[PDB]
Structures are given as structure tokens and as C-alpha cells.
């Protein structure tokens, strides 16, 4: 399962680093996604990283603010959001693309395995 | 008097005294799978960087010599210091730190002077 | 007189910090993993020369002979697994059941005899063969018996070679000709900054590579006081390599008496299983004398107030969480890899103010993942007989906590991880320099 | 030179810790690859070559 | 939707693959180009 | 099968070297034992060597007198008994631990394969 | 005047002028997986073929020297040419092409002459 | 007269005559997969043990020389033998067998003498 860092609270301007460790492998086999959920309104695509080829794919909005890394030793994805704002308060999820048995999607599927969430609140 | 007879034993003594114990540095400067390649890269390197120094000496006026007095005037802008203050106070590291910048310039002067000296000696033998 | 000329001096004492390739010099029975038989035979009576009046600036955190030793040990641990069996035929549906012999309720359901089918000599015949595995190696398959090894979803392992022994042997790191290894012979040297008494040596002392997790074992003690070291102690993202000055003796044992049984899985290659446990099954453990452990904790907490204020509540806690090899004092004891639970040593609260021992219960694994790599595991063959090792706890690897609001309390929970800190607790004294002879200096002489 | 189909990888596990990166699906309509060489500036360089030949 | 130029140049070939377990098989599929597959018994 | 050296006769003080060659492999798979039989009275454990890990295990009595070696090239066990005596006259066997198909005991089983015996007689 | 201060920069100038810029060739003559073995064979070779030349010089009368005048009479059958025509017209390649054949003979003469000179100097010191 | 012009050809002749044919030993002393590593360890070794000898000579008073007369008094306790008996009877092996023990002592004397000579020459140039 994917397990994330605990809920945090930051200031307007500071940088927040979320984390996502997947206990069970799935690192060189599937492609993971970073999705944040504003309070009580839908989701919002924010990134995607295939750790087998090491290809990152940032959304256009969060293209210059954030950057995501991979650490193969500890098997952890990181998402560092640099320029916070009062509107970046959201529950941040890391997901994983669908795996139908032993053949895992790497490029485009529905997210079937989610993380518990990391409630980042930034008031200002 | 014993540890001063050991490798780098004079690293704290003054230039005047350190430049008396020079052979103990010049002798321990070449003598000395996963460890077969780690001790082969160590051999072919210890010999490769000693010959650089021997060639640098050879192209200057002095090869196979330890205290070599050359024929290049000391440009006082390099250190502008008297003698009794550097041969009795400073250590060699303390001096390299002072002249580290004004090097790679002296080497060219030495090379040019030595080659000119070779040609002048050849000329002196020629007209004989 | 004032007419000074350039002179050159070859063989002059001057060095500059550098990075090179060092080579081992262990002394010259079954071979070990560190191949301390392809090392240059140790030069005895090494010529440590005291260097007077010299003040060199050391650094144990941006050192590079601790980044070199790590990759040496890794590439030297992998090269001793190529000749050894590759346990790919073992990834098979097992059928496990709990062992039926007298089992203490603490060790209940920690061993199971899984009986699988194996390929014979003949690629067409199968044999129904059984063995004994630990609960941390088998993983159930269909939760609705039927287990499977833990690493058939990632890389398959290469069973180590039973002739090769993991016992750590002292390794002397030598410097090639033209280089020098400067050690900081100095008592109160916190790791960085100048060292008012340096010395030269050709080969570092015996650095036996032990691989522990959160308690440095069989190390080298400090000289007079419990020295605490860190990159910036004010930061709570850098470990704190505490080093004792008196060793805390720890007795680790595995009281079951195993019995090997070699199973043939191919043409001329065997898989050393565990056939039977003779006697009654009893949990492994380790004992640390409570008196001489509480006393060293007192010493450490005294030296931890020189950096945090005398009126500071310093309390220890057990590990935070994560993998089994980071929340637990892992090590190997005679070839069996223990995973002990140190939540009994690190449990106390300190405020500015016999003959019992602290039995910490250990687990044991056979499928191990050293150096935390993805596509690499390693089956460790069984060891017969009661195992018992007597070690020295020399240091710790603590981690502060990000407790804000400047609370008077500070929790120190242990934590391991990268093995580099294990070496760095021994390579803090040393730095490698490059001799640069051939200096230039003016004097009153002129070449004829 | 271009390949206009939009592929979609899908990694298949064929053993213990080693995968085979297949092609799961083609999104959209399938279209032949090709390359374009401008006929003017290609015929002109063929003229140059035939002059030097 | 395949343009008649690229017709019959791709095929989804569904085979059996060895699982984690040397005894279980999985029915898995992929897409190969016509220059990688070769028919076996000309009589799928 | 294991086959041993021929029957010998030695003097009180001399050293006797028995041998045991196993035709059929079984060297890196099982653990062999050295047992001697005094004339017409039972057996007597005398040693044990696992040639896979190279661990020898001498009895306490014959701990300092004898020493046993392995030669992997010729696949032969040797047992050299140094300080002979009038009471070391016995039939010397080399055995092999039980093998149930392809899984051979290495540490503790019943001896199922024996050598023919090497009658060493030392009168004095 | 700049490119003539570069490696082989005088490869077209006359022997008289080329034999003035010699240090720039003698300095760039030692200085300098699948590429780990391709650059290791390049190191252990660059040093191995430099010591051959240094030894050839050492066993002759002159080691650590660039223009060495020796004591072996020039057998005119080798080139039978005047001086002003070869030190002012030909280049060094143009000369090696002329004397490529009549070599490996001169080297033995030089060796014998130098060892005889060593023994004669030893004798001269002996009777003192 | 021909085989005596070959490598080690004078290994039986007396020291007096053998010490006349020295260049033929000094020349064949550097010149010279599973065989790629067996002939690479042979190259990096032949050059590594030749530079040791050349350095031993260089730190003594004589580098690039075959018969070097030094300035260290022969302590008669080493061999206590006349000259005409060792330069006309013994061979070099026969002599090394006699002096094999009393070595590694002479080398330090030579080093100290040479460095003292360097410093004395520097002083002699200084007061000029
Ligand atoms: C920190 O450092 C310390 C010290 O530096 C480390 O401590 C070392 O730990 C080692 C690991 O246990 C330990 O190794 C043991 O040595 C014992 C003595 O070795 C010497 O004697 C033997 C034989 O006399 C020689 O072969 C050897 O070369 C030495 O000279 C050995 O006896 C040990 O082997 C036995 O124990 C292990 C595990 O207990 C078994 O796997 C092994 O098969 C042996 O088993 C016998 O003993 C057990 C009971 O312990 C029996 O159940 C079993 O059946 C065997 O007993 C039979 O045979 C014996 C001998 O004939 C007989 O007496 C008995 O009655 C039975 O018939 C093992 O090899 C080091 O000694 C120890 N100290 C040193 C200085 O190295 C510590 O590990 C380090 N910590 C870390 C984390 O690295
Ligand atoms: C892990 O699990 C394995 C099983 O995979 C256990 O090994 C078995 O242990 C049982 C119990 O000891 C054995 O059962 C006994 O078999 C005897 C005859 O077996 C023969 O035939 C089989 C094939 O059928 C051969 O493989 C075997 O080698 C023999 O040749 C019976 O006679 C026994 O019954 C007698 O004793 C019992 C009490 O012990 C009485 O109830 C009976 O009435 C009768 O008196 C008994 O049934 C079994 O053979 C073992 N299997 C194998 C393959 O060896 C391991 O012991 C277990 N590991 C543990 C417990 O640590
Ligand atoms: C290879 O196989 C192992 C064993 O099946 C996989 O690890 C295990 O995966 C299962 C399935 O997710 C985990 O079970 C889950 O547990 C959580 C609670 O933690 C529960 O909420 C879920 O509903 C589910 O039951 C199990 O914990 C996990 N075991 C571990 C990690 O030790 C592994 O993921 C597989 N790897 C690959 C690359 O296929
Ligand atoms: C060792 O770690 C300590 C942290 O415990 C480092 O000191 C702290 O460094 C951080 C980051 O540089 C500082 O945070 C900064 O604070 C200023 C306001 O003071 C703010 O404007 C910045 O945006 C940033 O947040 C912090 O002040 C500083 N001091 C503390 C925490 O007391 C220390 O520098 C490290 N040592 C090194 C790097 O050598
Ligand atoms: C580590 O420490 C534990 C506990 O201090 C040790 O376990 C204890 O060992 C003693 C010594 O044999 C046991 O005493 C005996 O127990 C038997 C069975 O109950 C009894 O019949 C005897 O009369 C005697 O009392 C004791 O039971 C046992 N367990 C305890 C105290 O809970 C262990 O041996 C130590 N291990 C090492 C390696 O130091
Ligand atoms: C860990 O195990 C070691 C054993 O290797 C324990 O050290 C040993 O402790 C015993 C006491 O139980 C010491 O016995 C002493 O013997 C002397 C005479 O030899 C006697 O005068 C004393 O009164 C005492 O009976 C033994 O010497 C000692 N071994 C060593 C090498 O010091 C140690 O106590 C165990 N620690 C824990 C925490 O279990
Ligand atoms: C191969 O593809 C390249 C594109 O990478 C084509 O070159 C591009 O051609 C377009 C015309 O379709 C050029 O646009 C021009 O833009 C300038 C202002 O930027 C405007 O003034 C012109 O009127 C024209 O619209 C574009 O610059 C040019 N790109 C480059 C790098 O030169 C090329 O034509 C294609 N060739 C074939 C044979 O398909
Ligand atoms: C691998 O298989 C071969 C062939 O089965 C084994 O060698 C053979 O083992 C049998 C069984 O012991 C030998 O037969 C025996 O012959 C003796 C007379 O010499 C007889 O008294 C016994 O009753 C039995 O019939 C056979 O001679 C032997 N063949 C040889 C050595 O060429 C071999 O031992 C097996 N190896 C392993 C490691 O399993
Ligand atoms: C070992 O192999 C045997 C032979 O195939 C297996 O026994 C069969 O198991 C299947 C699966 O349940 C049954 O449907 C068959 O009826 C069994 N046959 C017999 C003759 O009993 C056995 O399950 C295998 N054991 C493993 C893989 O652990
Ligand atoms: C560290 O100590 C804590 C006790 O505070 C342990 O946490 C408990 O562990 C037991 C056993 O699994 C659980 O039943 C409890 O629910 C846990 N409580 C909490 C608050 O976590 C912990 O297991 C110890 N070891 C670690 C963290 O490695
Ligand atoms: C490490 O040991 C501690 C205590 O020694 C364990 O914490 C206890 O676990 C038991 C269950 O195993 C609980 O009933 C207790 O409430 C726990 N706390 C105590 C006794 O204070 C801890 O679980 C152990 N570590 C792991 C990973 O199990
Ligand atoms: C940590 O230590 C504390 C005290 O030092 C332990 O707290 C009590 O320990 C006694 C054992 O003598 C128990 O009987 C009490 O129930 C404990 N108190 C509470 C509130 O549980 C504590 O158990 C220790 N924890 C571990 C994991 O060893
Ligand atoms: C554990 O620590 C003890 C004490 O430091 C070590 O015993 C000392 O070992 C040194 C050699 O390293 C000797 O010079 C001392 O005389 C010893 N002291 C005593 C009191 O015995 C011991 O070697 C360390 N390692 C173990 C026990 O494995
Ligand atoms: C994949 O494996 C299955 C199981 O064996 C194959 O299905 C069998 O195929 C044979 C060959 O035509 C038939 O005779 C059987 O009746 C099939 N069994 C079932 C249950 O359908 C399948 O053909 C394999 N697919 C491949 C190899 O591409
Ligand atoms: C510096 O150290 C040297 C070491 O020999 C010593 O001789 C000298 O007197 C020292 N100079 C001082 C302490 O000023
Ligand atoms: C076997 O052990 C497990 C512990 O995981 C337990 O749940 C189960 O009931 C046990 N079964 C038997 C038959 O002992
Ligand atoms: C180590 O000592 C130096 C010099 O006193 C000091 O600058 C540095 O902060 C010390 N390091 C620590 C971790 O206290
Ligand atoms: C540890 O020692 C200190 C003083 O040395 C004492 O105050 C404390 O009570 C001790 N703790 C235990 C558990 O013995
Ligand atoms: C190519 O160019 C030549 C002249 O440049 C012209 O004669 C010829 O018709 C051209 N061919 C085409 C196909 O345009
Ligand atoms: C599949 O493509 C082949 C082209 O090789 C064609 O002959 C065949 O008729 C096609 N079948 C179907 C069902 O499209």
C-alpha cells in the first residue's frame, strides 16, 4: 500500500514536501500520479511519474511551482510545492495506475490504488 | 631526532631545517578481482605522477637533484619578503599558501631559461 | 645580497587535500565475504610519525574515504555471490503448517514446515520435498496453507555459499605511494574544525566492517568522554553518532538447535534447507545489563546537555516506524541475521537532578536485503547448533525530533539506514592528502 | 519523420523481479508513419550531386 | 479505426506467461507489429 | 559407494592414515562420519566432517590424537590417527548420513551408507 | 609567434629554427568498462614508450638534456651534406626521411663511446 | 667476443672484465583475456621496478651513469679484501654473495652524503 506523510500546516510562501512510500514494490512496474483535492470539490491533476523510465509529467499550472523526485533505495515519491498560497490548501493524494493481475499500466489508466491523504492547510 | 628522520617528519620545522631533510620525502614518493584493480590503478598512478615531477625537473636546468639553484631572477612582486624571515619562520605549507597563486608562471621562465642555456652552450662549443 | 634568485626543492613537505583509490591491507581456513586474502599482507609495526606544530582542518562529514569504503564493501559483497546458487527454482507454491513440537507461546507460529515440489535431476520428474521457513520469509497467497517466499514478486535471491563466512575481519586502508593519510590524534575532536595535533600514517587501523542498524557494535571507543557528533546538532534531519568510552556488553543468542538438510534443485547445485529443530523451540533474544546500560545512558544525556541547556528534559523513545531493518537493531551473529527489538533500551525520561538484564526479543530472517537495493536479495543458509555471540555496544545512531515551540522536552529515537555512518564512526580521524613536492623559493645564489 | 499513433505501455511481469514492457493499447485512430523531404530542396540537391557526378 | 494503409500491420497477440510461481500461468496480451510476428501453421 | 584402504598393521607409536573415497558424488551434499569398532563389541564415535562447509567435529577422546582432512579433487576423506596403542586395534568405518531421495542430512541422522572396513591391528 | 609556441608548431620551419623550440614537444610527450580499459592501455603505454627514449638518452652521454653534443665522428657516407644546406633548408621530417635507413648504427656507436668515456673518467680519477 | 656482447654474456668473467660490458645489461632491462592481463601485469611491473633503481641512483650522487665513484669511505669490516683479488678473481655473483648481508647500510650513507653535498654546493654558491 502507498502511505504518505502526516498532515501539515505551512505559511504563505513556504515550501511543503509531501511523501509517498509504496510498501509492496510496484516501483519499476507502474506509473504513479499526484492529485490534490481542494476542500469538498472534486480533484485536480497535478503530476505523474513513471519510475521505470524516470519520466515526469507536470500539469501546466503546477509546472513551475512544484517538482517531484524518486528515491529507489527507500522506494518513495516526493512532491515539493514551493510557492504556497492561501488557495493551495487541499488533501494531497498519491495514486497508482490500474494493474490487472501482473500487467500494470504505465502511461494511462484509472487510478486504482490511492494514498491516505495529506491535509496541507495554508491560511493567510 | 628520530621522527624528524621519518616521512613528512619535518612538516612543522622551518624551511631552513625542512630543506635539510629532503631525501626522506623523495624516497617514499614512489616506493610505497576488486582489490586487484584497486591496487593496479594505484600502481600505474604512483608512477605516472612521479614522472611528471621528474620531467618538470628535467626540462628545467636540474634533473636528478634536490636543491637546484637556477638562473631566473626572483620577481619581487611575487612575495616581496626578506630571506631571514622566510627561511627561519615559515614552514613549507605556509609558503605554498603564499605562492600558490604566483606559480605556473615561474615554470615557463625556467623552461625558457634552460633551453636558452642549452643553445648557448652548444654555440660556445661550436666556435671552439 | 638582495639579489635573490629562484630555487627549486624536490622532495619538500607540502600536501593538498585529494581523493584517490585506497587498497586494503588485512592480514593473511574458510574465506570470508570481504575477501581479506587478496589484500596486501599487513605491514607490521607501521611508521606513525608525529607531525609537530601543524594544524590541519579535518572534516568527517564531507570525507571521501567513507564514500569509497562503502562502494568497496558493496562491490566486494556482490562478487562473492556470483559463484553461488541462484534460488530461482524455489519460487513455488508452498504448503505450510505450524511446526509440531514443544513451542513456547512467544515463538508460536514463527516457524512453518512448507512442503513443495522441486525439480529433480531430470527436467521432467518432480519431488515432494519439505523444509522449515521463518514467518518473515513466507507470505500467504490466497486468503480464503499455500504460502510463497517473500521475494517472488521482486528479484530472486542467490543463496550464499556455505564456505564463505560473514565474520568481519579487520581491514587496513592504505594510501598509494605519493599520498599520505593524516590522522587527528586528539581527544576532544567533535569531527570538524582544526585538529591541533595531527600525525601521518601509511595504513589506517583495523576497521572491521560490521553491518548493524541502530547500535554500533564492536567499534572503537572514545578516549576520555562520550563524544557526540553531528553535522549541525541544531538540525533534526541529521543523525547524531554518539560514541561511548566504555563498552556495553550485549549477549545475543538463538537457543533452538537447527539441523541442516541439503536439497538438490538442479544438476550439481544444492539448496541447504532446515530439516528439523531438535528439542523445544525458544525465542531468540539479547541481554544488555541494566546497570551498565542505564549508566551509559546517563553519561550520554550528560553530554547531550552541553548542546541543549542544563534544564532540558531529554527523553528517549523507541523507533519511529518503517521497514523491519530500520526500526530494529539488525545485525548478523555467526552467520544468522537477527532483528532485535530495541524498544526496551530506548525508553526513559531524564530530568536535571542490580544483576538484572534487559532481554530484548529478536526475530530472524533468511531472505535479506543488504544495502537496500531493489533487485537484489540473498538467502542466508542455515546455521547449526545454538548460536551465541558476545559484542560491544560502542555507539548509537540517534535522531532528534522536530518538536517546535521550544518545549523543554527532547525525544531521541534511534534510527539507522545508510550503512555509511557505521564506517564514518571509524573514519572520522583520517583524511587523505596528496604530497606536492617540488616547491619554489628564493635564495641568494645563481647558477653558473 | 513522425509516428502518428499514440501508444500506451503496459509492463508485464515475466519472472522474479524482471518486467517486459508491452504495448497495451493505441489511443485514437491508427495511422501510418512517414517522413517528409521537401521536393524542391531535394530535387535541387540531386541536381548538385548529378553535376558533381 | 485503421486507415487501409496501416491495415493488418498490428495485432494483439494473447499468450500465456509464467507468473511469479513457476507453476501458475497467466493469460496476458500485447500488441506486436507485423514485422515481429511470424505465422506458425498455415492451415492465429 | 564409499571404499576404503586395505587392512593395515602398525607399531605402537606410529601413525595410521585410513582413507575413504566415495564413488558417486555425495561430497557437497551430505555429512560423513568416522566410526571404529573394537573387536566384537559395539561401535565408537570418532569424528564427523561436512565437506560442504568444511566443518570437522572430533570426539573428545580422539580430539588431540587424530585429524581428518578432505580432498575435493579425488573426493577422499582421510583420518590420520597419530599416537597408536595396543587398544586402538579396531575395524575403522566411514559412513554417510541418511539421504531420503535427493535431500541428504548434513548434521544429524542415522548412518545409511557404510564403508567396507579397514582392520588396523596394533599389538604390543 | 604564437602557433610556433604550440605543440609541433615548428613542423615546417627549418632545423635551425625548429631546434630552438624543443621544450614544447618534450613537454606534451607524457602530459596528455570499455573506456576504462581503453584509457588505461593509453596511460601504461604513454609512460612505457617515454622511458625508452629517456633510457636511450641516459645510456648515451646525455640524459636530461635537449641539445646534446656527443663525441662520435659523423661518417660522411651517411648523408654527405654540408651544414648550411641542412640547418637552413630542410625540416626535421625531411631529414628523418634522409637518415631513416642509416640509424640503429649510430646508437651502438654512441653507447660504446659513452661507456668508454665512463671507464676513462674512472681511470682518470683512480690514478689521482 | 660475440656472446660476451650478449645479455648477461659476462656473468662468468671477472668483475674487472664484466664491469666493462655494462650497457648490454642496462639496455635489456626495460626493453623486453588471460594473456592480456598476463602481459599487462608484466609491463606495469618491468617499468615499476626499473624506476626504483633509477631513483636509488638519483638520490645518490649519480643518476644516468654506469660507473659512479662516490664519496663514502669503504668500511673495511664489510669485506676486508684487497683490490687485485676481487677485480681479477671473483665474479659479480660471487661478490654479491659476499656482500649481500652488509647492504641497506651503505645506501643510507650514500643518501646522507649526497644530500650533504647538495647543501654544501648551495652554500658555496651562496657566499659567491
Ligand atoms: C564482535 O566481536 C566478537 C569478538 O571479536 C565476536 O565474537 C565472536 O563470535 C563468533 C560467532 O559466534 C564466535 O565464533 C565461534 O567460535 C567458537 C570458538 O571458535 C574457536 O574454536 C573452534 C573449535 O574449537 C575453531 O574451529 C575456531 O576456528 C576457533 O578456534 C566456535 O566454537 C563456534 O562454532 C560453534 O558455534 C556456532 C554457533 O554457536 C555453530 O554454528 C558452530 O557450528 C559451532 O557449533 C558448536 O557449538 C555449539 C554450541 O555453541 C554446539 O551446539 C554445536 O553442536 C557445536 O558444538 C560441538 O562442537 C564443539 C567443538 O568440537 C564442541 O565443543 C561441542 O561440545 C559440540 O561437540 C563459532 O565459530 C567467536 O568465537 C567469537 N569471538 C571471537 C574472538 O571471534 C562477535 O561475533 C562480534 N559481533 C558481531 C556482531 O560481529
Ligand atoms: C513438517 O511436515 C512434514 C510433512 O511434510 C513432517 O514430516 C512427516 O512427519 C510425520 C510424523 O512424524 C511422518 O508420518 C509418519 O509416517 C510413518 C511412515 O512414513 C513412511 O512413509 C512415508 C510415505 O507415506 C515416507 O515418506 C516416510 O519416510 C516413511 O517411510 C508412519 O508409520 C507414522 O505413523 C506411526 O506413528 C504415528 C505417531 O508418530 C502414529 O500416529 C501412527 O499410528 C503410527 O504408529 C507417521 O504417520 C511423515 O512420514 C513425515 N513426512 C516426511 C515426508 O518425512 C515434518 O516432521 C514436519 N516438521 C516438523 C514437525 O518439524
Ligand atoms: C508481491 O506480493 C506481496 C504479497 O501479496 C505484496 O505485498 C502485500 O500486498 C497485499 C495487497 O495489497 C497487502 O495486503 C493489504 O494490506 C492492507 C493493510 O496494510 C489492506 O488494507 C489491504 O486491503 C490489503 O489487504 C499486504 O499488506 C502486502 N504485504 C506486504 C507489503 O508485506 C506485494 O505488494 C507484491 N508486490 C508486487 C510488486 O506485486
Ligand atoms: C544546521 O541546521 C540548522 C537548523 O536546525 C540551520 O539553521 C536554520 O536554517 C534554516 C534554513 O536556512 C533557517 O530558516 C530560515 O529562517 C529565516 C528567518 O530566520 C527565514 O526567513 C527563512 O525563510 C528560513 O526559514 C533558520 O533560521 C536557521 N536557524 C535556526 C533554525 O535556528 C543551520 O544553518 C544548519 N547549519 C549549516 C547549514 O551549516
Ligand atoms: C538473557 O537473560 C535471560 C533472563 O535474565 C536469561 O534467561 C534465564 O536464564 C536462566 C539461566 O538458566 C534461567 O534459569 C533457570 O531456568 C530453568 C527453567 O525455568 C530452571 O529450571 C532453573 O532452576 C533456573 O531457574 C531462567 O529460567 C531464564 N529465564 C528467565 C529468568 O526469565 C537468558 O539465559 C539470558 N541469555 C543470555 C545469552 O545471557
Ligand atoms: C554476557 O555473557 C558473558 C559471558 O561471556 C558474561 O560475562 C561473564 O560473567 C560471569 C558471571 O556470570 C563471569 O564469571 C566470573 O568469573 C570470575 C572468575 O573467572 C569470578 O571471580 C566472578 O565472581 C564471576 O563468577 C565471567 O568472568 C564473565 N566473562 C567475562 C569474559 O568477563 C556477561 O556477564 C554477560 N552479560 C549479560 C548482560 O548477560
Ligand atoms: C519539417 O518541420 C519543420 C518544423 O520543425 C518545418 O520548418 C518550419 O516550417 C514553418 C513553415 O511551415 C516555419 O514557420 C515560419 O515561421 C516564421 C516565423 O517564425 C514565418 O515568418 C514564416 O513565414 C513561416 O511561417 C518554421 O520557422 C520552420 N521551422 C524552422 C526551425 O525552420 C519544415 O518546413 C518541415 N519540412 C518538411 C519537408 O515538412
Ligand atoms: C547419481 O546417480 C548415479 C547413478 O545412479 C550414482 O552412481 C551409482 O549409484 C548406485 C547406487 O549406489 C551404484 O549402485 C551400487 O553398486 C554397488 C556395487 O558397486 C552395489 O553394491 C549397490 O547395491 C548399488 O547397486 C552405482 O554403482 C553407481 N554408479 C557409479 C558410481 O558409476 C551416483 O552416486 C549419484 N550421485 C549423487 C550425488 O546422487
Ligand atoms: C506437488 O505435486 C503434486 C502432483 O501434481 C500435487 O498434487 C496435486 O495437487 C493438485 C492441486 O490441489 C490436486 O488437484 C491433485 O489432485 C493433486 N494430485 C495428487 C496425486 O495428489 C501437489 O499439490 C503439489 N504440492 C505443492 C505444489 O505444494
Ligand atoms: C514502540 O513503542 C510503542 C509503544 O508506545 C509500540 O506501539 C504499540 O505497539 C503495539 C504492538 O504492535 C500495538 O498493539 C499498539 O497499538 C502500538 N501503539 C502505538 C501508540 O503505536 C511500538 O510497536 C513500538 N515499536 C516500534 C514503533 O517499532
Ligand atoms: C518491541 O517491544 C515492545 C515492548 O517490549 C512491544 O510493545 C508491546 O507489544 C505488546 C504486543 O506484542 C503489547 O501488548 C504491549 O502493549 C506493547 N507495549 C509495552 C509492553 O509497553 C513492541 O510491540 C515490540 N515491537 C514490535 C515491532 O512488535
Ligand atoms: C518503559 O519504561 C516504563 C518505566 O520505566 C514502563 O512503564 C511501566 O513499566 C512497568 C514495568 O515494571 C509496568 O508494570 C507498567 O504498567 C508500566 N506503565 C505503564 C503506564 O504502562 C514501560 O512499560 C516501558 N515500556 C516498554 C515498551 O518497555
Ligand atoms: C569489548 O571491549 C573490551 C573493553 O574495551 C575489549 O577488551 C579489551 O581489548 C583490548 C584489545 O582491543 C585489550 O587491550 C584490553 O586489555 C581489553 N580489556 C579488557 C578489560 O579485557 C574487548 O576486546 C572488546 N571486544 C569484545 C569483547 O569482543
Ligand atoms: C493458454 O493456456 C490455456 C490453458 O492451457 C490454453 O487453453 C487450452 O488450449 C488448448 C489448445 O487449443 C485446448 O485444447 C484446451 O481446451 C484449452 N483449455 C481451456 C480451458 O480453454 C490456451 O490455448 C493458451 N493460450 C495460448 C498458448 O496462447
Ligand atoms: C614548531 O614546531 C617545531 C617542531 O620541531 C619546533 O621545533 C618549533 O620550536 C616550534 N615553533 C614554535 C613553537 O614557535
Ligand atoms: C498456526 O499459526 C497461526 C499463526 O499465524 C494460527 O493463526 C493458526 O491457528 C495456527 N494453526 C495451528 C493448527 O496451529
Ligand atoms: C567542533 O568544534 C569546532 C571548533 O571548536 C566548532 O566550530 C564546531 O561547531 C564543533 N562542532 C560541533 C558539532 O559542535
Ligand atoms: C539511572 O542512573 C541514574 C543516575 O546514575 C538514576 O537517577 C536513575 O534512576 C537510573 N535509572 C535506572 C532505571 O536505574
Ligand atoms: C529539378 O531541378 C532541375 C533544375 O534545377 C529541373 O530541370 C528539373 O525539372 C527538376 N525536377 C523536378 C522534379 O522538379
Ligand atoms: C487480418 O489481417 C490480414 C492481413 O494479413 C487479413 O488477411 C485478414 O483478412 C484480416 N482479418 C480480419 C478479421 O480483419
Numbering used by the authors:
A (entry chain H), F (entry chain I): 3 to 52, 52A, 53 to 82, 82A, 82B, 82C, 83 to 100, 100A, ...
B (entry chain D), G (entry chain B), H (entry chain F): 516 to 547, 569 to 664
C (entry chain C): 31 to 58, 64 to 141, 150 to 187, 189 to 309, 312 to 321, 321A, 322 to 398, 410 to 504
D (entry chain A): 296 to 309, 312 to 321, 321A, 322 to 349
E (entry chain A): 137 to 141, 150 to 187, 189
Quote from the publication:
Functionally, the V3 crown is required to interact with the co-receptor CCR5/CXCR442, but this interaction only becomes available after CD4 binding, which triggers a large conformational change of the Env trimer that allows V3 to swing out from its packed conformation below V1V2 in the prefusion state. Identification of vulnerable sites defined by broadly neutralizing antibodies (bNAbs) on HIV-1 envelope (Env) is crucial for vaccine design, and we present here a vulnerable site defined by bNAb M4008_N1, which neutralizes about 40% of a tier-2 virus panel.
To map the epitope of M4008_N1, we determined a cryo-EM structure of the antigen-binding fragment (Fab) of M4008_N1 in complex with BG505 DS-SOSIP trimer at a resolution of 3.2 Å. We determined a 3.2 Å cryo-EM structure with a 3:1 Fab:Env trimer stoichiometry. The M4008_N1/DS-SOSIP complex structure showed that while each Fab of M4008_N1 is tightly packed into the crevice formed by two adjacent gp120 protomers, it engages primarily one gp120 (primary gp120) on one side of the crevice, with a total interface area of 1357.6 Å2, mostly involving the protein component, but also some contacts with surrounding glycans. The epitope of M4008_N1 occupies a large protein surface area, with a diameter of about 30 Å on the surface of the primary gp120, surrounded by a number of N-linked glycans. M4008_N1 forms direct contacts with these four glycans with a total interface area of 684.3 Å2, about 39% of the overall interface area between M4008_N1 and the Env trimer. The CDR H3 loop of M4008_N1 consists of 17 residues (Kabat definition) derived mostly from V-D-J junctions, with an intra-loop disulfide bond between CysH97 and CysH100b, and it forms the shape of a hammerhead like that of PG9/PG16, though not as prominently protruding from the body of the antibody.
